[PDB]
Design an enzyme around this catalytic site. Structure first.
Site, short mmCIF file in Angstrom:
data_model
loop_
_atom_site.label_atom_id
_atom_site.label_comp_id
_atom_site.label_asym_id
_atom_site.label_seq_id
_atom_site.Cartn_x
_atom_site.Cartn_y
_atom_site.Cartn_z
N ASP A 103 0.81 -1.21 0.00
CA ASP A 103 0.00 0.00 0.00
C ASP A 103 0.84 1.27 0.00
O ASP A 103 0.31 2.35 0.24
CB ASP A 103 -0.93 0.01 1.24
CG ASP A 103 -1.96 -1.09 1.21
OD1 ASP A 103 -2.59 -1.32 0.16
OD2 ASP A 103 -2.14 -1.70 2.28
N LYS A 148 -0.71 -8.42 -2.41
CA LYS A 148 -2.02 -7.80 -2.43
C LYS A 148 -1.82 -6.33 -2.82
O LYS A 148 -1.08 -5.58 -2.14
CB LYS A 148 -2.65 -7.90 -1.03
CG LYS A 148 -4.09 -7.37 -1.06
CD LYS A 148 -4.73 -7.57 0.34
CE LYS A 148 -4.28 -6.47 1.33
NZ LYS A 148 -4.63 -5.12 0.91
N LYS A 184 -12.20 -4.33 -2.54
CA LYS A 184 -13.36 -4.26 -1.64
C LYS A 184 -14.65 -3.93 -2.41
O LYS A 184 -15.39 -3.05 -2.05
CB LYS A 184 -13.06 -3.27 -0.51
CG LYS A 184 -12.06 -4.00 0.43
CD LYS A 184 -11.86 -3.31 1.74
CE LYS A 184 -10.67 -3.84 2.45
NZ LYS A 184 -9.40 -3.55 1.76
N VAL A 185 -14.90 -4.72 -3.46
CA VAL A 185 -15.93 -4.34 -4.46
C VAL A 185 -17.25 -4.32 -3.73
O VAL A 185 -17.60 -5.27 -2.98
CB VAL A 185 -15.93 -5.36 -5.62
CG1 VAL A 185 -16.98 -4.97 -6.58
CG2 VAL A 185 -14.55 -5.41 -6.28
N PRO A 208 -24.94 -5.04 -8.70
CA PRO A 208 -24.43 -6.15 -9.53
C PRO A 208 -23.85 -5.70 -10.87
O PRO A 208 -22.72 -6.13 -11.23
CB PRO A 208 -25.68 -7.07 -9.71
CG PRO A 208 -26.40 -6.84 -8.40
CD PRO A 208 -26.27 -5.34 -8.11
N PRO A 260 -6.00 -10.05 7.43
CA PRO A 260 -5.25 -8.80 7.69
C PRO A 260 -5.44 -8.33 9.11
O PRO A 260 -6.36 -8.77 9.82
CB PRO A 260 -5.92 -7.81 6.73
CG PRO A 260 -7.40 -8.27 6.76
CD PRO A 260 -7.38 -9.76 6.97
N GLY A 261 -4.62 -7.35 9.47
CA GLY A 261 -4.62 -6.75 10.81
C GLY A 261 -3.44 -7.22 11.64
O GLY A 261 -3.44 -6.95 12.83
N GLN A 305 -2.09 -3.17 13.21
CA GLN A 305 -3.42 -3.05 13.80
C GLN A 305 -3.51 -3.86 15.08
O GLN A 305 -4.53 -3.84 15.74
CB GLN A 305 -4.47 -3.53 12.80
CG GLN A 305 -4.57 -2.67 11.58
CD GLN A 305 -5.64 -3.22 10.62
OE1 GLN A 305 -6.80 -3.39 11.00
NE2 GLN A 305 -5.24 -3.54 9.38
C1 LIG Z 1 -8.21 -6.70 3.24
C2 LIG Z 1 -8.53 -5.76 4.38
C3 LIG Z 1 -9.68 -6.00 5.13
C4 LIG Z 1 -9.77 -5.57 6.45
O1 LIG Z 1 -10.72 -5.95 7.19
N1 LIG Z 1 -8.69 -5.06 7.05
C5 LIG Z 1 -7.61 -4.69 6.33
O2 LIG Z 1 -6.63 -4.20 6.93
N2 LIG Z 1 -7.53 -4.90 4.97
C6 LIG Z 1 -6.40 -4.37 4.17
O3 LIG Z 1 -5.25 -5.15 4.58
C7 LIG Z 1 -4.10 -4.28 4.67
C8 LIG Z 1 -3.67 -4.23 6.13
O4 LIG Z 1 -2.38 -3.59 6.09
P1 LIG Z 1 -1.56 -3.30 7.46
O5 LIG Z 1 -2.52 -2.97 8.55
O6 LIG Z 1 -0.82 -4.54 7.79
O7 LIG Z 1 -0.67 -2.14 7.08
C9 LIG Z 1 -4.54 -2.95 4.10
O8 LIG Z 1 -4.33 -3.00 2.68
C10 LIG Z 1 -6.02 -2.94 4.39
O9 LIG Z 1 -6.72 -2.16 3.43
#
Ligand SMILES: Cc1cc(=O)[nH]c(=O)n1[C@@H]1O[C@H](COP(=O)(O)O)[C@@H](O)[C@H]1O
Ligand SMILES: Cc1cc(=O)[nH]c(=O)n1[C@@H]1O[C@H](COP(=O)(O)O)[C@@H](O)[C@H]1O
Lengths: 215, 215
Positions: B10, B32, B62-63, B67, B170-171, B175
């Protein structure tokens, strides 16, 4: 918005998108550009449209990520010249606040999408929509999107947000919504395929405007 | 996924994104890519990464539209060379089916995002997440995303989807999620900032892998 009509420009080819937008420009002054066009032609298409047509551009990106990512998305979108961005409320208050923070820094606007117009919206979004709207009010959101396909739900959204907030509404035409009924509650309607797939988009836009002036 | 680790790339600058991805390539084989990078550098970045690194690419878009629009988004994303796309389940079954239809036509995969990792996810998404997951199962979704920050919720998601479905999470890191705990339930972890903001991304990725092999 000129004539209370916003064009949803979801053609995926720059030449076709430019042709249609040019043909209907006298009837609108706001163009909604989303991912079908942006992911096909690039973010530079926003500034191109803004220049060529002198329209306002709403980036319909349905921003729906965590707060940190939402900030990056909004920054990139405003850098590209969008006047406003559409944000989902379903991911919660921190995600919406992140978008509001960037809009404040860059002198732009957030539109909060509270209930969607398609049939699937009934499954999860509808039951949260009133609370999403109230969350918007409490965050100070002033611009909202709600569904032409369910005018009773559009009325309930207007009830929550009050008369001073600005409300735009998709689902007119192709999805079954009616311009006049929708404008009982919304300030403006969004129209995509009923205009851009028509044999004559200018005549389609004119027809809609004619039925709008009659209100 | 090599080493059960997926890089969330990102960064918003092509040069920095290429540098970091190259430095950690030995530790991953799936990247990703989301809107921060795509909206800053263009959709062409997907094919560039796919070629340069020989990785699989998951488009984290995150579509979350109706539809008809979801079909256009998915088509553009697969045309750009993505192997899979992340789709929100909150907009309902018809919206998810539209993405599944395009993935079937183009020989690709959908990942369904059922519960998000940030604090705001508690407001609306969490209370629908079990039903979103069950909807996924009934639509035949085989790939899911759920939150490292709430391993009890990750366990409940795994319970619904069964052991044969693929679950990424993720997280981790920034996070507050833990790699080892998350891998009790997920098949792979997604890591962004803990790697790409580190003074030494390769050493950060290696450190994570070392703690993963220990499981
Ligand atoms: C897929 C997604 C879903 C979600 O619930 N949480 C999340 O962090 N993401 C993404 O995962 C990545 C988490 O990155 P870090 O927190 O590890 O930087 C970012 O691209 C978020 O947009
Ligand atoms: C903003 C939005 C929210 C929603 O609930 N419904 C919807 O149609 N949209 C978008 O509006 C436009 C509707 O276009 P037509 O149905 O008029 O073609 C498309 O760009 C949709 O993605």
């Amino acid at each position: 918005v000129m004539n209370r009509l916003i064009l949803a420009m979801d053609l995926m080819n720059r030449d076709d998108a430019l042709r249609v937008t040019g043909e209907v420009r006298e009837y609108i002054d706001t163009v909604k550009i989303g991912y079908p066009l942006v992911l096909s032609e690039g973010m530079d298409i926003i500034a191109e449209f803004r220049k060529r047509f002198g329209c306002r551009i709403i980036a319909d990106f349905k921003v729906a990520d965590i707060p940190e990512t939402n900030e990056k998305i909004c920054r990139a979108t405003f850098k590209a010249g969008a006047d406003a961005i559409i944000v989902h409320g379903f991911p919660g208050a921190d995600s919406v606040r992140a978008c509001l923070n960037v809009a404040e820094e860059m002198g732009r606007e957030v539109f909060l999408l509270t209930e969607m117009s398609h049939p699937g919206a009934e499954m999860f979004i509808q039951g949260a929509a009133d609370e999403i709207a109230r969350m918007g009010v409490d965050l100070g959101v002033k611009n909202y999107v709600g569904p032409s396909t369910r005018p009773e739900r559009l009325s309930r959204l207007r009830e929550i947000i009050g008369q001073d907030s600005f409300l735009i509404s998709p689902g007119v035409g192709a999805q079954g919504g009616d311009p006049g009924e929708t404008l009982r509650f919304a300030d403006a309607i969004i129209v995509g395929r009923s205009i851009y797939l028509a044999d004559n988009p200018a005549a389609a836009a004119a027809g809609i405007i004619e039925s709008i002036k009659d209100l």
